[PDB]
Structure 1
């Protein structure tokens, strides 16, 4: 099963109970964005991140009464149609708001049962993606495909280190390709145990395909209330990319000397084949539109891995 989260007086996490940390319900988010939850029917704002006032420019109480209808007039019917009751928690809808306080915000919404989860992040506003797609497809074998993928991602993102991390049948991981800035250690060829990416995180990574830590020294921002009014239970944040990263996992990034980290799931035959895994030495908020490019690349790599593995077997 899982332990209760901390804020419901559950046990603190060790290297003895790695598998039972409830990574999906931390009750908090990373501070480079803001999150609201809301009722599926009424559009009634039920929870907000204590930092919402910053991003939205709204007097705190104003929000926690109001309706999405009021708050987001153009958007609220689109949401209603895009995310019908009963849809999967994996389905997401995005829009760009030109919002008074903040030039442009990206809005990302998904639905978990009766709750809409809304994420707001700063945003903005060429051929590198098309060029990359063809490059991946003409790679002659899996090894070269891995090399092209890591190089392409590094060029698109500027990340200090991009790796392709492949899982063995026992969930033992191996860095099979790597693109990195001059003057970093080389993780190429190294294997790491299966507990370094524990079972409950690999399951989540099979369904929700992109996650990040923007700053491995930043404090999480609580949800208020912490419990969902609807249920008097924890809000599932598994499908939110603003969800706080497990402190057990940020301690392992800090000990490695990484200040920023992103990964994309490569999913083949319904299973987690491997990860595009990115490091930055310093804090780094990759903007939403560039993340989208990596999300596309994730799908394309999933296709090409199968194609390429089929021409060996």
Structure 2
């Protein structure tokens, strides 16, 4: 039965169990993962509204100084580029990405999308022809199995993960791991089927719009936004589009029970429907640089294209 969301935990909304998984409002945790920083600021005036508590550690600035300034004074060169690439009324999937030279944190990756009248700003630290060779490999795959096989090994060879899996959905939302490149000693997941209440209904929806989510350390503690609610509206901040969005404690409990430390999955969208995920497991905590994650963001599109062209020939 599809039911609507609870309030979050910070708006008096109940604690989650296995009975009511589909009612968690995962899109509004009011908190980011600690490996980066996140501001939200005004769409038009550039007024810095909220920030993650740890934004000082990362930006080498105090909140009182930060929040008492505009994005014009803070990001003088970037601000017009933000305005130009993210005009008003544009979709929240659209991101503008840039590099900074921040004196305290070194080179900083700035990712920015708009959510109504709210520019969400992310900050991460950031540090030869392997994707091109990967591109032509996938295309010259003879069939959907050799496509799936090369994608998973390519993805592993680029990223360095313990278990990379291409996971495919079925018509009734049941899934099954169709290919994997794994670490030597790890027990296979190849050909396991998994029930429909594993990736729940509110999750699969969000995963069709935004095509890359991750979890760095399944033992880390969510860094909360400050203030937790959006001053514009006095309502939760839509952090569904943010990659720094903290992962749910239901999900973190699960991954710890498997001996997993880090997780990454690229979505594969065919016909505007979630065809499958390129999931990645790691036994230790593992942060992937944003510039390297851009390579995987590309592979998701590339694979989504070939997935279709392969299935056209299977008929």
On whether the aligned pair clears a TM of 0.5, the verdict is yes
Q: Deviations over 1:240-293 (max 9, x none)?
A: 000000111111111111000000000000000000000010000000011000
Give the Cα separation in 2 of the matches to 1:5 and 1:65. 28
Displacement of 1:220: 0.3
Displacement of 1:103: 1.1
Q: Deviations over 1:131-170 (max 9, x none)?
A: 0000000000001100000000000000111000000001
Give the Cα separation in 2 of the matches to 1:123 and 1:173. 34
Give the Cα separation in 2 of the matches to 1:259 and 1:181. 15
Counterpart check, 1:70 vs 2:73: yes
Give the 3-state SS of the residue equivalent to 1:196 in structure 2: coil
Displacement of 1:127: 0.4
Give the 3-state SS of the residue equivalent to 2:314 in structure 1: coil
TM-score (norm: length of structure 2)? 0.98
Give the Cα separation in 2 of the matches to 1:98 and 1:282. 30
Runs of 4+ in structure 1 over 2 Å off: none
Give the Cα separation in 2 of the matches to 1:291 and 1:201. 21
How many residues matched? 312
Displacement of 1:185: 1.7
Give the 3-state SS of the residue equivalent to 1:237 in structure 2: coil
Counterpart check, 1:223 vs 2:232: no
Displacement of 1:223: 0.2
Counterpart check, 1:55 vs 2:58: yes
Give the Cα separation in 2 of the matches to 1:121 and 1:194. 34
Give the Cα separation in 1 of the matches to 2:211 and 2:46. 27
Give the 3-state SS of the residue equivalent to 1:175 in structure 2: strand
Give the Cα separation in 2 of the matches to 1:283 and 1:51. 19
Give the 3-state SS of the residue equivalent to 2:49 in structure 1: strand
Structure 1 gap ranges (5+) = none
Question: Which residue in 1 is equivalent to 2:19?
Answer: 16
Displacement of 1:60: 2.2
Give the Cα separation in 2 of the matches to 1:187 and 1:266. 20
Give the Cα separation in 2 of the matches to 1:13 and 1:307. 41
Give the 3-state SS of the residue equivalent to 2:34 in structure 1: coil
Give the 3-state SS of the residue equivalent to 2:84 in structure 1: helix
Give the Cα separation in 1 of the matches to 2:235 and 2:100. 31
Give the Cα separation in 1 of the matches to 2:248 and 2:56. 25
Displacement of 1:65: 1.3
Q: Deviations over 1:165-187 (max 9, x none)?
A: 00000110100000011011211
Question: Which residue in 2 is equivalent to 1:308?
Answer: 310
Match of 1:279 among 281, 305, 309: 281
Structure 2 gap ranges (5+) = none
Give the Cα separation in 1 of the matches to 2:171 and 2:254. 24
Give the Cα separation in 1 of the matches to 2:146 and 2:200. 29
Q: CA RMSD in A?
A: 0.5
Displacement of 1:74: 0.1
Give the 3-state SS of the residue equivalent to 1:31 in structure 2: coil
Match of 2:195 among 178, 193, 196: 193
